[PDB]
Amino acid sequence: AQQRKVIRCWNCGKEGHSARQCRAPRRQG
Ligand SMILES: [Zn+2]
């Protein structure tokens, strides 16, 4: 429900958003 899991998006390498949420690199995010 609240989904509280700090994650370092592998996309660019930032923490606070999953790959799909990381709109930096174009690849599932
Ligand atoms: Zn990121």
Curated annotation (Swiss-Prot):
Protein purpose: Encapsulates and protects viral dimeric unspliced genomic RNA (gRNA). Binds these RNAs through its zinc fingers. Acts as a nucleic acid chaperone which is involved in rearangement of nucleic acid secondary structure during gRNA retrotranscription. Also facilitates template switch leading to recombination. As part of the polyprotein, participates in gRNA dimerization, packaging, tRNA incorporation and virion assembly.
Subcellular location: Virion
Taxonomic lineage from the root: Viruses, Riboviria, Pararnavirae, Artverviricota, Revtraviricetes
Zinc finger (CCHC-type): 7-24
Name of the molecule in the record: Nucleocapsid protein p7
Domain of life, per lineage: Viruses
